[PDB]
Amino acid sequence: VADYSVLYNSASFSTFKCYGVSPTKLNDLCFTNVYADSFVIRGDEVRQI
Amino acid sequence: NLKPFERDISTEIYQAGSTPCNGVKGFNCYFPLQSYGFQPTYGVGYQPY
Fold this sequence. Notes:
This is part of a larger assembly, with two copies of chain A (49 residues).
Chain A: H1 5-8
Region (Integrin-binding motif) (chain A): 42-44
Protein name (chain A): Spike protein S1
């Protein structure tokens, strides 16, 4: 069970962007599997993702 | 969402998503109004109907 309230509503990170679903709707919604892809890039390459 | 046969003529800056940003753009909201990209030289998808 993952808590997305401290990950989003706390506003402890720099920025976030959502696609197709609101960030406040992720508490009552979920799918079959969840993955996390960790990588390091530059600032000018953020828009390329 | 707007119900069938409902009119809103307001052109001002209001709430976009589920989190009100209180007027002026910022606080992880976006600018609601957008403009058409119609180009005479491109294909069918960009042609106005």
